[PDB]
């Protein structure tokens, strides 16, 4: 067996003819580029993310939606303004673009007895 392919007949595994060693095949990262604008009426400081691209091969933040550059992740939590994905979304709060996880709402412990 020289090479292996999975479903969609994608050749994904081969054996080198010299060492007789089996290897893997993985297409290098491809994806889209999306801008996160707070509107030209307000500012011009934009941010960019690269969908499902590890950004070791592209200040910088890594999400499940990709890697987002140009905004600083805050470990606070607010209400969603510009959706991004994976529960993380960005807003324009003081002066710069920030990225945070969504807040679903306030917590209540109803006085049940």
């Amino acid at each position: 067996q020289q090479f292996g392919r999975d479903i969609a007949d994608t050749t994904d595994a081969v054996r080198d003819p010299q060492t007789l060693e089996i290897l893997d095949i993985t297409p290098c990262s491809f994806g889209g580029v999306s801008v996160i604008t707070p509107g030209t009426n307000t500012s011009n400081q934009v941010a960019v993310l690269y969908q499902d691209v590890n950004c070791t091969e592209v200040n910088v933040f890594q999400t499940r939606a990709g890697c987002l550059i140009g905004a600083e992740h805050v470990n606070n939590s607010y209400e969603c303004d510009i959706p991004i994905g994976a529960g993380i979304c960005a807003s324009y709060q003081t002066q710069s673009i920030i990225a945070y996880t969504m807040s679903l709402g306030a917590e209540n412990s109803v006085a049940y007895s």
């Binding site: 969609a8 994608t10 297409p27 491809f30 994806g31 889209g32 969908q51 499902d52 499940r64 939606a65 959706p83 994905g85 994976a86 529960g87 979304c89 969504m102 679903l104 709402g105 306030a106 917590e107 209540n108 412990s109 109803v110 006085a111 049940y112 007895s113």
Partner: protein
């Protein structure tokens, strides 16, 4: 003409309803799909105008709609309610559906079972709300409906003991509170039994949700597999045609591949639009069901399950919701003899809220849905006219409380 059937017992039954709410978000790239790193194909593709802004626009609209579906169905509660550490719900046991913070993603037993039970120019965009956030929406909904009843949908949550809430619900169906309070233990026991039986049936089905996933997957596989079709050209590959023929002569042979791939992409987008319309209809139904069966009772029959609706619980699924409708099903009926009215002292009497029944010798007034004989007095009866116009009148006595005690 004079026979009625009145139930003497009842059964609490919990039944599940599964309903798709969303579908996977996808996007395509014309340049990478039709051409795939080939400048000549890109040069020829611009001859067709803007046939590749429209496809991206359609797919983007589908994706945004997909996020809005979940947002409408689930995020119907403004706050996140928590169950108390101590759980004394009058004997009712919600440990199967209540979220537990001892496992992964704060899910419940039934949600865990329910989740276990189910390249080249293509991307699958992640959903906006992760499974954990949908889980805490569902947990908030259950906590609110357990602690407050239906008050948290109309405004501020107002706590109420669970047994009193179930008495409210029984009163809504048309059964008095004493029916709940006199046999609370039986009702709690059979509710627990039913909620364990649904667990067993699910452990051993969920086809409506799987169908959507399968159908999307097969559509995408067809789209990918359509790339290797010749479409009446020399060969499928764009290198085997450019690197073997004169470009002025291979220009005509490229157009077949471009047209075929454009047709395939257009067909895919049209099917996705129709399927998204259907999934949106289903999501709107799910949102209505949430607002009407979870945030309150429903008088609409067969809308929140078979039987007389009491209350419902939502559960998050891989791409949908699961409603556990608990209903009141009357059973063990026995048949009596009725009469529209009672003529006493030449005067017609009608039941205030029940019906007149007789076990053969005596007459009673019982509520319509549960057998509770009562003595026909003037307190549970009103008078209109005289006993000469109503057909089917019978004769007996009506008790006035004042006379026996006065003397």
């Amino acid at each position: 003409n004079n026979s009625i059937a009145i139930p003497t017992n009842f059964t609490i039954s919990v039944t599940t309803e599964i309903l798709p709410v969303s579908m996977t978000k996808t996007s395509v790239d014309c340049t990478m799909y039709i051409c795939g790193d080939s400048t000549e194909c890109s040069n020829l593709l611009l001859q067709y105008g803007s046939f590749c802004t429209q496809l991206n626009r359609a797919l983007t609209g589908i994706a945004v709609e997909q996020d809005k579906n979940t947002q409408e169905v689930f995020a119907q509660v403004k706050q996140i309610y928590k169950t108390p550490p101590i759980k004394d719900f009058g004997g009712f046991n919600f440990s199967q559906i209540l979220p537990d913070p001892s496992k992964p993603s704060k899910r419940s037993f039934i949600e865990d079972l329910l989740f276990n039970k189910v390249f080249n120019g293509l991307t699958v965009l992640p959903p906006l709300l992760t499974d954990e956030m949908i889980a805490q929406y569902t947990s908030a909904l259950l906590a609110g409906t357990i602690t407050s009843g239906w008050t948290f949908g109309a405004g501020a949550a107002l706590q109420i003991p669970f047994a009193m809430q179930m008495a409210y619900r029984f009163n809504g169906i048309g059964v008095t509170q004493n029916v709940l309070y006199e046999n609370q233990k039986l009702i709690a026991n059979q509710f627990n039994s039913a909620i364990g039986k649904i667990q067993d049936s699910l452990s051993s089905a969920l086809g409506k949700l799987q169908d959507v996933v399968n159908q999307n997957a097969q559509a995408l596989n067809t789209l990918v597999k359509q790339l290797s079709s010749n479409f009446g050209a020399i060969s499928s590959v764009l290198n085997d045609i450019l690197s073997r023929l004169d470009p002025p002569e291979a220009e005509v042979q490229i157009d077949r591949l471009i047209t075929g791939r454009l047709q395939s992409l257009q067909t895919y987008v049209t099917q996705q639009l129709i399927r998204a319309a259907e999934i949106r209809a289903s999501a709107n139904l799910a949102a209505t069901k949430m607002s009407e069966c979870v945030l309150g009772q429903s008088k609409r029959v067969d809308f929140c399950g078979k039987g007389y609706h009491l209350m419902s619980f939502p559960q998050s699924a891989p791409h949908g919701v699961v409603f556990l409708h608990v209903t009141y099903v009357p059973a063990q009926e026995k048949n009596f003899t009725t009469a529209p009215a009672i003529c006493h002292d030449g005067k017609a009497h009608f039941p205030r809220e029940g019906v007149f029944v007789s076990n053969g010798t005596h007459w009673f007034v019982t509520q319509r849905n549960f057998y509770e004989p009562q003595i026909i007095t003037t307190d549970n009866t009103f008078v209109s006219g005289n006993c000469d116009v109503v057909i089917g009148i019978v004769n007996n006595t009506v008790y006035d409380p004042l006379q026996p005690e006065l003397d």
